[PDB]
Write a protein that holds these residues in place. Sequence first.
Motif, PDB file in Angstrom:
ATOM      1  N   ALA J 127       0.842  -1.182   0.000  1.00 47.97           N
ATOM      2  CA  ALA J 127       0.000   0.000   0.000  1.00 47.97           C
ATOM      3  C   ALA J 127       0.891   1.250   0.000  1.00 47.97           C
ATOM      4  CB  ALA J 127      -0.947  -0.018   1.189  1.00 47.97           C
ATOM      5  N   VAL J 128       1.879   1.269   0.885  1.00 48.31           N
ATOM      6  CA  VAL J 128       2.785   2.414   0.985  1.00 48.31           C
ATOM      7  C   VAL J 128       3.372   2.746  -0.376  1.00 48.31           C
ATOM      8  CG1 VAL J 128       4.764   3.430   2.083  1.00 48.31           C
ATOM      9  CG2 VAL J 128       3.399   1.814   3.335  1.00 48.31           C
ATOM     10  N   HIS J 129       3.987   1.757  -1.016  1.00 50.68           N
ATOM     11  CA  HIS J 129       4.465   1.902  -2.402  1.00 50.68           C
ATOM     12  C   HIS J 129       3.407   2.515  -3.312  1.00 50.68           C
ATOM     13  CE1 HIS J 129       8.351   0.611  -4.113  1.00 50.68           C
ATOM     14  NE2 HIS J 129       8.542   0.048  -2.931  1.00 50.68           N
ATOM     15  N   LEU J 130       2.229   1.901  -3.345  1.00 50.35           N
ATOM     16  CA  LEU J 130       1.138   2.387  -4.193  1.00 50.35           C
ATOM     17  C   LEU J 130       0.886   3.882  -3.980  1.00 50.35           C
ATOM     18  CD1 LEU J 130      -1.244   1.888  -6.163  1.00 50.35           C
ATOM     19  CD2 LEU J 130      -2.657   1.311  -4.187  1.00 50.35           C
ATOM     20  N   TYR J 131       0.743   4.287  -2.726  1.00 49.79           N
ATOM     21  CA  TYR J 131       0.466   5.695  -2.452  1.00 49.79           C
ATOM     22  C   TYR J 131       1.638   6.619  -2.889  1.00 49.79           C
ATOM     23  CZ  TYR J 131      -3.674   3.945  -0.007  1.00 49.79           C
ATOM     24  OH  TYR J 131      -4.869   3.341   0.282  1.00 49.79           O
ATOM     25  N   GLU J 132       2.873   6.139  -2.741  1.00 48.16           N
ATOM     26  CA  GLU J 132       4.028   6.913  -3.194  1.00 48.16           C
ATOM     27  C   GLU J 132       4.028   7.090  -4.709  1.00 48.16           C
ATOM     28  OE1 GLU J 132       7.082   4.784  -1.158  1.00 48.16           O
ATOM     29  OE2 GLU J 132       7.442   6.458   0.264  1.00 48.16           O
ATOM     30  N   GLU J 133       3.795   6.007  -5.432  1.00 54.23           N
ATOM     31  CA  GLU J 133       3.634   6.077  -6.883  1.00 54.23           C
ATOM     32  C   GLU J 133       2.523   7.031  -7.299  1.00 54.23           C
ATOM     33  OE1 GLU J 133       3.369   1.915  -8.038  1.00 54.23           O
ATOM     34  OE2 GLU J 133       5.559   1.640  -7.811  1.00 54.23           O
ATOM     35  N   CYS J 134       1.496   7.199  -6.456  1.00 52.47           N
ATOM     36  CA  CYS J 134       0.459   8.215  -6.705  1.00 52.47           C
ATOM     37  C   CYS J 134       0.808   9.662  -6.314  1.00 52.47           C
ATOM     38  CB  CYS J 134      -0.836   7.823  -6.023  1.00 52.47           C
ATOM     39  SG  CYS J 134      -1.578   6.352  -6.723  1.00 52.47           S
ATOM     40  N   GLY J 135       1.984   9.901  -5.746  1.00 54.22           N
ATOM     41  CA  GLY J 135       2.414  11.260  -5.392  1.00 54.22           C
ATOM     42  C   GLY J 135       2.330  11.584  -3.896  1.00 54.22           C
ATOM     43  N   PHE J 136       2.006  10.587  -3.084  1.00 53.61           N
ATOM     44  CA  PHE J 136       1.938  10.797  -1.645  1.00 53.61           C
ATOM     45  C   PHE J 136       3.355  10.714  -1.061  1.00 53.61           C
ATOM     46  CE2 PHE J 136      -2.600   9.876  -2.078  1.00 53.61           C
ATOM     47  CZ  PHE J 136      -3.161  10.647  -1.067  1.00 53.61           C
ATOM     48  N   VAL J 137       3.659  11.572  -0.091  1.00 55.60           N
ATOM     49  CA  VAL J 137       4.928  11.497   0.614  1.00 55.60           C
ATOM     50  C   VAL J 137       4.725  11.342   2.119  1.00 55.60           C
ATOM     51  CG1 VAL J 137       7.073  12.738   1.163  1.00 55.60           C
ATOM     52  CG2 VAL J 137       6.042  12.916  -1.150  1.00 55.60           C
ATOM     53  N   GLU J 138       5.534  10.505   2.759  1.00 56.39           N
ATOM     54  CA  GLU J 138       5.557  10.421   4.217  1.00 56.39           C
ATOM     55  C   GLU J 138       5.829  11.756   4.928  1.00 56.39           C
ATOM     56  OE1 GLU J 138       7.931   8.485   7.801  1.00 56.39           O
ATOM     57  OE2 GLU J 138       7.732   7.053   6.124  1.00 56.39           O
ATOM     58  N   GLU J 139       4.954  12.090   5.867  1.00 60.02           N
ATOM     59  CA  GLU J 139       5.193  13.200   6.769  1.00 60.02           C
ATOM     60  C   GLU J 139       5.198  12.752   8.236  1.00 60.02           C
ATOM     61  OE1 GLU J 139       2.084  16.159   6.596  1.00 60.02           O
ATOM     62  OE2 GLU J 139       0.487  14.687   6.480  1.00 60.02           O
ATOM     63  N   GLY J 140       4.905  11.493   8.508  1.00 60.82           N
ATOM     64  CA  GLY J 140       4.921  11.021   9.870  1.00 60.82           C
ATOM     65  C   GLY J 140       5.012   9.518   9.937  1.00 60.82           C
ATOM     66  N   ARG J 151      -2.867  -6.090  19.005  1.00 60.28           N
ATOM     67  CA  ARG J 151      -1.631  -5.369  19.341  1.00 60.28           C
ATOM     68  C   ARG J 151      -1.529  -4.023  18.622  1.00 60.28           C
ATOM     69  NH1 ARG J 151       2.595  -6.743  14.638  1.00 60.28           N
ATOM     70  NH2 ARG J 151       1.194  -8.110  13.420  1.00 60.28           N
ATOM     71  N   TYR J 152      -0.753  -3.115  19.204  1.00 61.50           N
ATOM     72  CA  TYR J 152      -0.540  -1.788  18.632  1.00 61.50           C
ATOM     73  C   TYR J 152       0.500  -1.827  17.509  1.00 61.50           C
ATOM     74  CZ  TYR J 152      -3.387   0.585  22.176  1.00 61.50           C
ATOM     75  OH  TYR J 152      -4.445   1.064  22.894  1.00 61.50           O
ATOM     76  N   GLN J 153       0.190  -1.145  16.400  1.00 56.39           N
ATOM     77  CA  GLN J 153       1.076  -1.054  15.221  1.00 56.39           C
ATOM     78  C   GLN J 153       1.369   0.389  14.822  1.00 56.39           C
ATOM     79  OE1 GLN J 153       0.254  -3.423  11.712  1.00 56.39           O
ATOM     80  NE2 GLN J 153      -0.893  -4.952  12.906  1.00 56.39           N
ATOM     81  N   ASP J 154       2.512   0.582  14.174  1.00 56.02           N
ATOM     82  CA  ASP J 154       2.891   1.872  13.640  1.00 56.02           C
ATOM     83  C   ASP J 154       2.136   2.107  12.349  1.00 56.02           C
ATOM     84  OD1 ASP J 154       4.664   1.703  15.742  1.00 56.02           O
ATOM     85  OD2 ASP J 154       6.451   1.969  14.498  1.00 56.02           O
ATOM     86  N   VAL J 155       1.836   3.367  12.054  1.00 61.25           N
ATOM     87  CA  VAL J 155       1.242   3.714  10.780  1.00 61.25           C
ATOM     88  C   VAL J 155       1.942   4.926  10.199  1.00 61.25           C
ATOM     89  CG1 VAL J 155      -0.908   3.131  11.988  1.00 61.25           C
ATOM     90  CG2 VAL J 155      -0.610   5.433  11.083  1.00 61.25           C
ATOM     91  N   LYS J 156       2.082   4.920   8.864  1.00 57.93           N
ATOM     92  CA  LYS J 156       2.537   6.076   8.089  1.00 57.93           C
ATOM     93  C   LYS J 156       1.399   7.059   7.889  1.00 57.93           C
ATOM     94  CE  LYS J 156       6.635   4.444   6.993  1.00 57.93           C
ATOM     95  NZ  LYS J 156       7.856   5.119   7.476  1.00 57.93           N
ATOM     96  N   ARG J 157       1.734   8.334   8.039  1.00 54.95           N
ATOM     97  CA  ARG J 157       0.890   9.413   7.568  1.00 54.95           C
ATOM     98  C   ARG J 157       1.549   9.975   6.329  1.00 54.95           C
ATOM     99  NH1 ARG J 157      -1.422  15.268   8.296  1.00 54.95           N
ATOM    100  NH2 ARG J 157      -3.235  15.042   9.680  1.00 54.95           N
ATOM    101  N   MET J 158       0.763  10.090   5.258  1.00 56.47           N
ATOM    102  CA  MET J 158       1.249  10.483   3.942  1.00 56.47           C
ATOM    103  C   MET J 158       0.329  11.531   3.422  1.00 56.47           C
ATOM    104  SD  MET J 158       2.147   6.648   2.438  1.00 56.47           S
ATOM    105  CE  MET J 158       3.654   7.470   1.481  1.00 56.47           C
ATOM    106  N   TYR J 159       0.861  12.475   2.668  1.00 54.05           N
ATOM    107  CA  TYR J 159       0.046  13.554   2.176  1.00 54.05           C
ATOM    108  C   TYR J 159       0.429  13.898   0.761  1.00 54.05           C
ATOM    109  CZ  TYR J 159       3.928  16.777   1.976  1.00 54.05           C
ATOM    110  OH  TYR J 159       5.050  17.462   1.619  1.00 54.05           O
ATOM    111  N   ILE J 160      -0.427  14.710   0.155  1.00 54.31           N
ATOM    112  CA  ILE J 160      -0.192  15.342  -1.132  1.00 54.31           C
ATOM    113  C   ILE J 160      -0.975  16.661  -1.154  1.00 54.31           C
ATOM    114  CG2 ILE J 160      -2.131  14.247  -2.283  1.00 54.31           C
ATOM    115  CD1 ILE J 160      -0.632  14.215  -4.817  1.00 54.31           C
TER     116      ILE J 160
END
Lengths: 169, 169, 171, 170, 171, 175, 171, 171, 169, 170
Positions: J127-140, J151-160
């Motif tokens: 999913a992360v890859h997919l969103y990056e290919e769409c122009g999204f960048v990690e900001e968090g 259990r608790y998991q980490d998540v990426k916040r991505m924006y455009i």
Amino acid sequence: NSQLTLRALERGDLRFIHNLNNNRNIMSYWFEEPYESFDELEELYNKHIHDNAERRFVVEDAQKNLIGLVELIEINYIHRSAEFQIIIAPEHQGKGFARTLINRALDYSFTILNLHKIYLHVAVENPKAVHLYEECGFVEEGHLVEEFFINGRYQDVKRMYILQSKYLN
Amino acid sequence: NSQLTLRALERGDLRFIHNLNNNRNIMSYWFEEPYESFDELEELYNKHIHDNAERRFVVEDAQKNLIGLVELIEINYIHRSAEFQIIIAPEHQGKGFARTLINRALDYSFTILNLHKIYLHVAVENPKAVHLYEECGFVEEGHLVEEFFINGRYQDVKRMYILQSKYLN
Amino acid sequence: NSQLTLRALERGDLRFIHNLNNNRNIMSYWFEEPYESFDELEELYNKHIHDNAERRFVVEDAQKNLIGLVELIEINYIHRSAEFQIIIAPEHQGKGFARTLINRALDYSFTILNLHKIYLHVAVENPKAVHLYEECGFVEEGHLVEEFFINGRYQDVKRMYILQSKYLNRS
Amino acid sequence: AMNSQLTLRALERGDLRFIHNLNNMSYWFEEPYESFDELEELYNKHIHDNAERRFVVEDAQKNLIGLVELIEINYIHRSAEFQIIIAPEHQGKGFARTLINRALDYSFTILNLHKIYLHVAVENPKAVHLYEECGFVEEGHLVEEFFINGRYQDVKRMYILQSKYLNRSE
Amino acid sequence: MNSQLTLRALERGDLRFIHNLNNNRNIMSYWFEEPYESFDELEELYNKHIHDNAERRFVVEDAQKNLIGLVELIEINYIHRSAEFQIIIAPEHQGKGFARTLINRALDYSFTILNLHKIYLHVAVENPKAVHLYEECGFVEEGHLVEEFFINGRYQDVKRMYILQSKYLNR
Amino acid sequence: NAMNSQLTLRALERGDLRFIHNLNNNRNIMSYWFEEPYESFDELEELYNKHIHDNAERRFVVEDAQKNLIGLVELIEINYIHRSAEFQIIIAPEHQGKGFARTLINRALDYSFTILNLHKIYLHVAVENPKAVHLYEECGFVEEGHLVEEFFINGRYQDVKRMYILQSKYLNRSE
Amino acid sequence: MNSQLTLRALERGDLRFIHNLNNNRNIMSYWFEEPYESFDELEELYNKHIHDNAERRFVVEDAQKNLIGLVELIEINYIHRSAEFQIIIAPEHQGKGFARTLINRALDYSFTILNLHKIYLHVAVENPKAVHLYEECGFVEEGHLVEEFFINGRYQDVKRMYILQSKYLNR
Amino acid sequence: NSQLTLRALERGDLRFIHNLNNNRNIMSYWFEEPYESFDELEELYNKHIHDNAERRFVVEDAQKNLIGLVELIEINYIHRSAEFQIIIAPEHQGKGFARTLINRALDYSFTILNLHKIYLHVAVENPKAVHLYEECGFVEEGHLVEEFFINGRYQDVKRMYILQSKYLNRS
Amino acid sequence: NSQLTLRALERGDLRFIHNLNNNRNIMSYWFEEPYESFDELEELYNKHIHDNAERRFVVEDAQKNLIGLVELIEINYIHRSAEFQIIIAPEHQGKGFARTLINRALDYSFTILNLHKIYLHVAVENPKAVHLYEECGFVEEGHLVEEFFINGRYQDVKRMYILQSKYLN
Amino acid sequence: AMNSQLTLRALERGDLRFIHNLNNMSYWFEEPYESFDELEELYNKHIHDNAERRFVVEDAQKNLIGLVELIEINYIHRSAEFQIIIAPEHQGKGFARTLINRALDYSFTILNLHKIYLHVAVENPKAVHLYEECGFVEEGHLVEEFFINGRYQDVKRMYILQSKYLNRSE
Ligand SMILES: [Mg+2]
Ligand SMILES: [Mg+2]
Ligand SMILES: [Mg+2]
Ligand SMILES: [Mg+2]
Ligand SMILES: [Mg+2]
């Protein structure tokens, strides 16, 4: 006997419910409100359709004949307990379904519903039924004195229980 | 007689009970509210559908002919009493059914509702019904003077009762 | 006795009605619906305010003390009959007020409401009350066997009546 | 002396705050609730419902002492379940016995019920004693019935019958 | 003193006066043809019929605002152009000569503002002086209604008496 | 006479409202339902829903043995203190002059005096219909008022007779 | 053929006829003095004013139940005993001689059943033949209202014309 | 063109309105409340059914095909002006229908509704539409700079108007 | 000038804004609904209290005298525009306040609501207000012909705008 | 080919069943729900609420493919959070990319929003890859943010941003 399914009750099943809670000469209840007529029962169905203090399951065979009914009432979601009751339609009584239906009900209650304890009331004047539930793993924890007026006199019933932890060993 | 059944009243039965009022030069009541038109009856029915102060059973034979009506009204669950009445359709009168229906009603009242007293009112000028209820174990407890206006004048009625303890022994 | 007035019950009188229930030790009903709390009563009052099957009259003296209640219930306008009950607040009992209130109720029933018959139930174990109603013109028409569960057991009551024609022609 | 000045009166809307404070999980006509708003909604819904009946308990200076409840009232079988709660600040004063008997008077002389029963934690034999001294007898020892203090506990079911209560001294 | 009497349309605040007036004549009172005894019942009927034009009522006052009585028009039919009229004078003000004046004010409203054609009333046969008062105000007998009303203990006859617009306007 | 005895009275129902409406067809008078005026079927229907439990008026539809709709018996202004009511009968035009009126008057009186337990029935009848006046006299009614220009009917004010009968006179004739 | 025309009171089911009629005259239509264009708006106004007696409408039919037109009375005042009248004939039935008959039926209702005193109407000055039709039916001009209505692009004068009960009844 | 009719919008037309939004790719409003779903629109319709600040007319041919919509919005009855928009279903564009619909809208506005001024907004990047409105009598009164965000960027629109007096006196 | 404050309108302010309409021979609107009586104004106020299509600020000096009103209406959050108006009470006119209030309103519109365009309407026959808004950076974008009926005749108004990008640089 | 026949239309009341089935904990305008009745009540409450907007996704034969959501829409800061759900039976078909771009078209050409952001589980780098290919960048990289699978998991916040999306090919 392995051909027997529990299905959650739908509006269409109320006719069966009514036919069952019919020739039984005891007061019939829906969410603790009494009814005799179909129309009373329907109006009660509509009024309690979202309430999950009771859960009913229709029992069918392979060709979807209606065989009977499993009810759980007085459901308590903190203590995870419920009162169990079973009705076999008069035409299918005495053919060997009772044991199978009981173990299916316990399986549903203890795996899917994750209840901790199931109980029931059995008339003391029916020591056959008492012995049946005994054979199915229930045990006495109470001898309730004159608990119910049934057939023109007060009667005692056995309170019998089984725990999730025992049924799952 | 033994093939006569009692069935709790449904909406479908209102036409029957309405037609039963034709053969009676008297005012009818539904939960103590008077009515004349069927439409009035239907509204009263919807309004009191779960009201437990009255209970009615349609009588049928095995052919499902509509034989009559059994009514219990003024049901009080503190004093544990109720008033009883019966109507048998004109065509089915003098067939010896009355006694049987009276007993079915007492049976219901005393074995299932767990009532303590059942009373009724009989026109003093119907000593034939007076005698019949005597034969069923009812005893006079009052002679109500000019209680009801019937057929253009005030008339006395007997008030007759029977108790759970006598009917069950 | 002449300074005793009857006045149609109102919402403000409900607290008086509720307190009359305190030492009576029986179930109280409003238009045949059972209640114990003031909040229950207030709500039944609003529901049945246009219902003519019961009618009630607060009894006040000249100083507007609350003396008692006259109730007509089970009123029927075909047969023209009703059941009557009277209640006097305990701090006003034994002052002879009952007779006056019984007559005021009969007067209202037979000269204004135009009923034909008034009847009441009296505990068989209270022969003074029985004799009182007899002096007011009532006559036993029944002895109802184990009619009411009262204070731990079933009791018998007399059913007593008077007719409009007898009350209106009286001396 | 102090016991004889205890009064019971039917629960009103104004008493719901007192009720809320008595729980520092709760139920109202077998419906579950937590916040004061929730209770007040349930109260308006069940105000004329006759399956339960509550009496608040007060002294002569009108302080709130506790609560008597009759629930699961059934008028065919003519039975009900009884519960009593006394506020922390008024426990160990002898009130319980007095209130238990008022509740039975109400149940057996006015409601005309046949049977009153209660449940009492097995790990509270003082209560058990008290109820026995009042005429209650064990009819059940309910195994792992109620989740209380992070674990399941056994509870006694105890009952008494109308005729036993009323003829006691005869 | 009679020209100093005023009519003004009944307000909510005058309900208590109406209720005392009617309470004390020992008759069954009606508001827009619906019966009442309880004030709270009167008040609800008031709110329900507030814009209804089938009845109209005026409270009569002197210059000092003493409450004198009441002028009522009911059964107001705007096709046949008729209404029934009644006047009630508080007992303390009966005998003072106010009645003729009140009857005329009522007629003036009926005939010069509402444009009615016929006004009528009922008057107990057992009150022949009131019959005479109405005759002298222009009313004529058009019926003797036999046992029309049950009032204070018996069925009473009443005279029905009327006057027409054309007659009142050409005096 | 044969057909007179076979007439039935039954409580008005919703499905009878069309019939009531058609009965106003050539009556050229304002019709009312519980004292509220109306003209269309749809108006009447709504008034019927509104007063269905109202006891101040009562109506009975008249039919023969084949369930033809013969007419209407109407009791209005019913008061249960004074125990009086106003009565009217309407026969559909096709069924007039077959003698039914006498029979229906007697049924209305019977219902009023032996089931409702009323004390007095009255009616109003156009002074210009002396034939009906005479019919009501034959049924026991007596004139108690001659009401002057009481109603505006067909373009002018008309007089009516008010006529009454009492329960005691109707029930005690043969006693 | 004209004696074969009937008036019957407007029903819900006739709303669609009314709406087509009015749609096609290119004017702003009103129901009980409230404006509408949308049928759904007409229908809601209908439900709101169903028992309101300030306007009355009759649908005109032949013996074959063809819908001919509409007779309207509005501004019905029961004190002054006046109403405004209008007749609308569907375009296919204009010119057939129905109008005189419809005008008279309207007057007959107004004057023999509702007991009104005065009926009036507005008629475009630019329609002098309709003026003449109404004159010949008994109406007289009592006003020439200057630029009273904006109709099809300009302010138009209308004649106001009336007839009295007494005149219609003594023809 | 002559067979094109204007008809006040109704509830049944809402599905047509919703589908006209499909390939327009802008926010749609109902009485200034934004919506996308049919269920949103249906509910806004019921809320504003008596609101006269907007009015809408479905355009149908002789065969009752749905051709387009005429909307008047921001209607003000003091200043007598409204904003106009017209939408033709895509399968009916390029058939010359727009001119006819523009005139029908003007005719309704100026000969029936009696407005003084009609105005509209036209994308500056659509000079054909601009020239069309010019042929119908509209004149530019403004060039609104970056007025609307349309399809990824702010665009300019011409505001164009016509007055009642100019439309009504035209050749 | 620097001591003038803006404060969001409250219920207590309605009397003030109502009195401000006296000195204006024109019809007033609240969320595009016309009104004349205060009672009408109060109902409209309650009805639109959370409606975000309009926003009003009462202007006071440091003494809490009521100086005037700043209004933003037709707020659209897609196109990011709004119409601006100002009313200064008669006694406080020609004190040089107008310019300051205009700037406070732009400041709010552009720094906090993040709007993109602010427009207004000025009577063409008030070239003095025309010039003032020019000095504040508004530019004419339309000359609306016979737009408004004012003082007994139809009058032209300029429509003047300014953009977020010009005000912030 | 198949992608070009995907349509978006605004969610209706009739689509709530489909929504319910997509969860085999859920939220509606940030209100929590479980049963179908609960959702339908929340839907009637928020029908004109503009803080969220949903589009159901259909093919040419009108099958239900999935859902696009914009939530947390704020018209001052001009931002929103984006979520997409595709029904199990239609995953691994290339649809996601097509739908992501429709959602951005809507957000940037019609809503005129400035910023669109999303959250994507760190344990799903496809999913992360997919969103990056769409122009999204990690900001968090949000630590222990969401409880998922016991259990608790980490998540990426991505924006455009609007201008990046719209000028991409320029
Ligand atoms: Mg329970
Ligand atoms: Mg009763
Ligand atoms: Mg009347
Ligand atoms: Mg007017
Ligand atoms: Mg606007």
